[PDB]
Amino acid sequence: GPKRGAKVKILRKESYWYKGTGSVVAVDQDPNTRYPVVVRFNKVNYANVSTNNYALDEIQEVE
């Protein structure tokens, strides 16, 4: 998976940032959380929101 500060690609299809890149900020270590990973972005969506929570199978790592 990612770590803090990793650059990932969103694989969720209904996300605003599908096929788009961005930076992991916090990964919740508690596995009861379904979407443990805070990923931040530099471009806003239609509701002017800059971040979102994701699962580990929904993000890809770029290098």
- State which residue, 7 or 36, has the beta carbon closest to other proteins: 7
**Read out DSSP for 4-34?**
TT-EEEE--SSSTTBT-EEEEEEE---TT-S
- State which residue, 9 or 27, has the beta carbon closest to other proteins: 9
- State which residue, 16 or 35, has the beta carbon closest to other proteins: 16
Site for other proteins in 1-40 (CB under 8 A): 9, 13-14, 16-20
Q: Please list, in sequence order, all residues whose beta carbon lies within 8 angstroms of the beta carbon of residue 35, skipping any fewer than 6 positions away.
A: 53, 54, 55
Count of residues that bind other proteins according to CB under 8 A: 8
